[PDB]
Design an enzyme around this catalytic site. Structure first.
Site, mmCIF file in Angstrom:
data_model
loop_
_atom_site.group_PDB
_atom_site.id
_atom_site.type_symbol
_atom_site.label_atom_id
_atom_site.label_comp_id
_atom_site.label_asym_id
_atom_site.label_seq_id
_atom_site.Cartn_x
_atom_site.Cartn_y
_atom_site.Cartn_z
ATOM 1 N N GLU A 269 -51.408 -89.096 -36.746
ATOM 2 C CA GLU A 269 -52.704 -89.357 -36.120
ATOM 3 C C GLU A 269 -53.216 -88.210 -35.232
ATOM 4 O OE1 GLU A 269 -49.805 -90.795 -35.608
ATOM 5 O OE2 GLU A 269 -49.512 -91.477 -33.544
ATOM 6 N N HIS A 293 -54.586 -97.089 -40.883
ATOM 7 C CA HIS A 293 -53.564 -97.048 -39.850
ATOM 8 C C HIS A 293 -53.800 -95.828 -38.957
ATOM 9 C CE1 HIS A 293 -49.327 -97.427 -38.296
ATOM 10 N NE2 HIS A 293 -49.514 -96.139 -38.092
ATOM 11 N N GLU A 294 -53.941 -94.655 -39.574
ATOM 12 C CA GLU A 294 -54.195 -93.432 -38.819
ATOM 13 C C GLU A 294 -55.489 -93.526 -38.011
ATOM 14 O OE1 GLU A 294 -51.812 -91.815 -38.488
ATOM 15 O OE2 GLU A 294 -50.634 -92.328 -40.253
ATOM 16 N N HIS A 297 -55.050 -95.399 -34.754
ATOM 17 C CA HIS A 297 -54.364 -94.655 -33.698
ATOM 18 C C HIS A 297 -55.349 -93.956 -32.758
ATOM 19 C CE1 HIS A 297 -50.047 -94.913 -34.117
ATOM 20 N NE2 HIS A 297 -50.015 -94.525 -35.377
ATOM 21 N N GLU A 316 -47.119 -98.220 -32.240
ATOM 22 C CA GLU A 316 -47.084 -98.564 -33.655
ATOM 23 C C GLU A 316 -47.345 -100.048 -33.922
ATOM 24 O OE1 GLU A 316 -47.344 -96.546 -35.901
ATOM 25 O OE2 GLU A 316 -46.899 -94.710 -34.808
ATOM 26 N N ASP A 373 -35.837 -88.653 -33.693
ATOM 27 C CA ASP A 373 -35.987 -88.627 -35.139
ATOM 28 C C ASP A 373 -34.939 -89.500 -35.841
ATOM 29 O OD1 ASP A 373 -38.191 -86.926 -35.038
ATOM 30 O OD2 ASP A 373 -36.970 -85.116 -35.248
ATOM 31 N N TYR A 381 -42.696 -100.589 -35.813
ATOM 32 C CA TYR A 381 -43.910 -100.970 -36.541
ATOM 33 C C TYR A 381 -43.963 -102.474 -36.809
ATOM 34 C CZ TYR A 381 -44.382 -95.983 -37.679
ATOM 35 O OH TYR A 381 -44.550 -94.615 -37.584
HETATM 36 N N1 4BO Z 1 -43.933 -89.276 -37.820
HETATM 37 C C1 4BO Z 1 -44.799 -90.098 -36.987
HETATM 38 C C2 4BO Z 1 -45.420 -91.232 -37.839
HETATM 39 C C3 4BO Z 1 -46.635 -91.912 -37.160
HETATM 40 O O1 4BO Z 1 -47.074 -91.392 -36.105
HETATM 41 O O2 4BO Z 1 -47.099 -92.936 -37.724
HETATM 42 C C4 4BO Z 1 -43.998 -90.629 -35.784
HETATM 43 O O3 4BO Z 1 -44.443 -91.553 -35.102
HETATM 44 N N2 4BO Z 1 -42.788 -90.044 -35.603
HETATM 45 C C5 4BO Z 1 -41.926 -90.334 -34.589
HETATM 46 C C6 4BO Z 1 -42.241 -91.268 -33.579
HETATM 47 C C7 4BO Z 1 -41.285 -91.652 -32.630
HETATM 48 C C8 4BO Z 1 -39.986 -91.111 -32.675
HETATM 49 O O4 4BO Z 1 -39.012 -91.485 -31.762
HETATM 50 C C9 4BO Z 1 -39.256 -92.764 -31.088
HETATM 51 C C10 4BO Z 1 -38.680 -93.968 -31.510
HETATM 52 C C11 4BO Z 1 -38.645 -95.056 -30.622
HETATM 53 C C12 4BO Z 1 -38.109 -96.286 -31.032
HETATM 54 C C13 4BO Z 1 -37.603 -96.434 -32.328
HETATM 55 C C14 4BO Z 1 -37.633 -95.346 -33.219
HETATM 56 C C15 4BO Z 1 -38.168 -94.115 -32.813
HETATM 57 C C16 4BO Z 1 -39.667 -90.177 -33.678
HETATM 58 C C17 4BO Z 1 -40.632 -89.787 -34.625
HETATM 59 ZN ZN ZN Z 2 -48.449 -95.088 -36.666
#
Ligand code: 4BO
Ligand code: ZN
Ligand code: YB
Length: 608
Positions: A269, A293-294, A297, A316, A373, A381
């Site tokens: 986004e 979705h984007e 955001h 999300e 990551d 989500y």
């Molecule tokens: N690639 C974009 C896709 C998009 O924006 O839709 C993205 O949001 N990436 C992202 C976001 C959060 C991260 O860490 C936080 C986290 C917290 C709780 C649980 C899991 C992860 C790591 C990467």
């Molecule tokens: Zn998103």
């Protein structure tokens, strides 16, 4: 309160209010060089020194007030990078600001950038570059307080080869010849709305645009521009619906950039210019939910922002909630419910994969010493959407809850917030239904692992035909095989075909003969819709169909959307017949893979 993912001084000590970016994009050295002018505001008196985040950054000099100052790089803390403590000549007090000019050089191995050779692009004649800063990779491009708890405007000018084009998460200011007389243009950008730094984005390549709306241009290499302009035609109508739900779209333009196959996500986004995977180009607009979705955001995420990544579900969960309203507005309430129920299924898959007591399946997580990551999944989500959907139904329906949603966006716009700010506002807004709100098991929903304590109610209309057919296949015996036929698919939409496969996939493996029969009657091999082919190949491989091995290997490598690439490499590794070729394919590809993707697949395969 502190952001456990950042090494920088916290917002409660100082805050970056602005960034000025001058830099040139060096394709031969594979580096970004330039200066990062940060306007910092102190939040305390006698502020003598602040700390910035960095990762593999070469610092050339730190200039303050025309003069150089004494800076120091700390010890690397693995994925976090190394802290950069800068020394201030004159001490700051409350709300006093200072501007700091860091001359920096990015590493060719920056986890934020992928550099593509011309042969890795559509037009084999020119190179390509793109950033992806979420979650904490902005520090891999430049020194910054790399936390979502800080918001800042920025202005940028960037030198690129005049045959190329630069684009950023900002409004384009204009193009002029470089001051140092190279064969380079210096493109200019301006972002007037305060954004967290993970929303700073840069693409440099042989880009070509095409307008598809009053505030929308689609950007891609020449060979994709035409298919994309078609695929995303609905974009402005989705924008209009989003504004009705969220309030005014404040960013000016909403452009779309269709990136190379190796872009790690379905979408990013980036403000003013959303990034999307080329795997959305199904040729029938069937994957436009990602666009919705984007777009969403632009309010939930970019306007109201999670204060730390522990509260990522706010970004999300709400955005998926808006996404499904936009699609519901467009195609009907029964479709919104079909999509919501599908999401619960994906949540089921995530919890089973991690395990139901696993910390990454909690809605609010603790990323102390966790690389964000690595924790990333559909949990925030879909568990976040589920909670909002459950609350919608509990509190009197979508009309009532969308009222809460718009007020929520209004109250926290331009701010960064936690789960408590959200929950406390929900109680304030629904002060007349506090007794209803006290019926919800907040502790389980917010802090317990596994599936949520309660499942919302879903209309089944569009889902029933998927269940009937999946169950027939799951329970099929030999005397059923002959009766299956392409007419089975006659009234199923692309979305229902996918859900059919998702449901069948939850009960894999199926007998090999059964999956061969399925290809025989439905010809799923011939579908190029990525979501559908993804789940079909997973089903074939998990069912031990060796003929599917090259198909799955091909998809896993010819594109790099991690949603598809990681599970395919993982299934291929698990299947004894393909294990060795899977591991060798990865090792042979990891060099030209996106850096984060390369690392994650390696951990998945346990290579190195
Ligand atoms: N690639 C974009 C896709 C998009 O924006 O839709 C993205 O949001 N990436 C992202 C976001 C959060 C991260 O860490 C936080 C986290 C917290 C709780 C649980 C899991 C992860 C790591 C990467
Ligand atoms: Zn998103
Ligand atoms: Yb039978």
């Amino acid at each position: 309160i502190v952001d456990t993912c950042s090494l920088a001084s916290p917002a409660s000590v100082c805050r970056t209010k602005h960034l000025h970016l001058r830099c040139s994009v060096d394709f031969t050295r594979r580096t970004l060089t330039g200066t990062a002018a940060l306007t910092v505001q102190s939040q305390e008196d006698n502020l003598r020194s602040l700390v910035l985040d960095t990762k593999d950054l070469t610092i050339e000099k730190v200039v303050i007030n025309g003069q150089e100052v004494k800076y120091a790089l700390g010890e690397r803390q693995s994925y976090k990078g190394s802290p950069m403590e800068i020394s201030l000549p004159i001490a700051l007090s409350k709300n006093q600001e200072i501007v700091i000019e860091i001359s920096f050089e990015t590493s060719p191995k920056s986890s934020a950038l992928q550099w593509l050779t011309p042969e890795q692009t559509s037009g084999k004649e020119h190179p390509y570059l793109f950033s992806q800063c979420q979650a904490i990779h902005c520090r891999a491009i430049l020194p910054c307080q790399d936390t979502p708890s800080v918001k800042l405007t920025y202005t940028a000018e960037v030198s690129v080869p005049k045959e190329l084009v630069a684009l950023m998460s900002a409004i384009r200011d204009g193009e002029t010849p470089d001051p140092e007389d190279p064969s380079r243009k210096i493109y200019k950008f301006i972002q007037k709305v305060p954004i967290p730094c993970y929303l700073i984005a840069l693409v440099v390549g042989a880009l070509e645009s095409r307008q598809i709306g009053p505030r929308t241009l689609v950007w891609s290499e020449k060979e994709q521009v035409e298919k994309s302009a078609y695929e995303f035609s609905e974009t402005e109508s989705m924008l209009k619906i989003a504004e009705d739900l969220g309030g005014p779209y404040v960013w000016g333009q909403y452009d779309l950039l269709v990136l190379p196959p190796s872009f790690p996500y379905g979408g990013m986004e980036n403000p003013c210019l959303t990034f999307v995977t080329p795997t959305l180009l199904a040729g029938d607009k069937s994957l436009s939910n990602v666009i919705a979705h984007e777009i969403s955001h632009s309010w939930t995420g970019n306007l109201v922002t999670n204060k730390t990544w522990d509260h990522f579900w706010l970004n999300e969960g709400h955005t998926v909630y808006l996404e499904r309203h936009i699609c519901g507005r467009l195609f009907g309430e029964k479709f919104r419910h079909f999509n919501a129920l599908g999401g619960w299924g994906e949540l089921q898959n995530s919890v089973k994969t991690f395990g139901e007591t696993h910390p990454f399946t909690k809605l609010v997580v603790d990323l102390t010493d966790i690389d964000p990551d690595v924790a990333y999944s559909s949990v925030p989500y879909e568990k976040g959407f589920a909670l909002l959907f459950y609350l919608e139904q509990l509190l009197g329906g979508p009309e009532i809850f969308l009222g809460f949603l718009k007020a929520y966006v209004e109250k926290f716009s331009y701010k960064s917030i936690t789960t408590d700010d959200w929950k406390d506002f929900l109680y304030s807004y629904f002060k007349d239904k506090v007794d209803v709100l006290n019926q919800v098991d907040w502790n389980a929903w917010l802090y317990s692992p596994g599936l949520p304590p309660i499942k919302p109610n879903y209309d089944m209309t569009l889902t029933n035909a998927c269940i009937a057919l999946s169950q027939r296949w799951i329970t099929a015996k030999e005397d059923d095989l002959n009766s299956f036929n392409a007419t089975d698919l006659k009234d199923l939409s692309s979305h229902q075909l996918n859900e059919f496969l998702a449901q069948t996939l939850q009960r894999a493996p199926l007998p090999l003969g059964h999956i061969k029969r399925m290809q025989e009657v439905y010809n799923f091999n011939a579908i190029n819709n990525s979501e559908i082919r993804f789940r079909w190949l997973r089903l074939c491989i998990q069912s031990k169909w060796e003929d599917a091995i090259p198909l799955a290997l091909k998809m896993a490598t010819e594109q790099g959307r991690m949603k598809f690439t990681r599970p395919l490499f993982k299934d291929l590794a698990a299947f004894d017949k393909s294990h060795d070729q899977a591991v060798r394919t990865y090792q042979e590809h990891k060099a030209s893979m996106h850096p984060v993707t390369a690392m994650l697949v390696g951990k998945d395969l346990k290579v190195d």
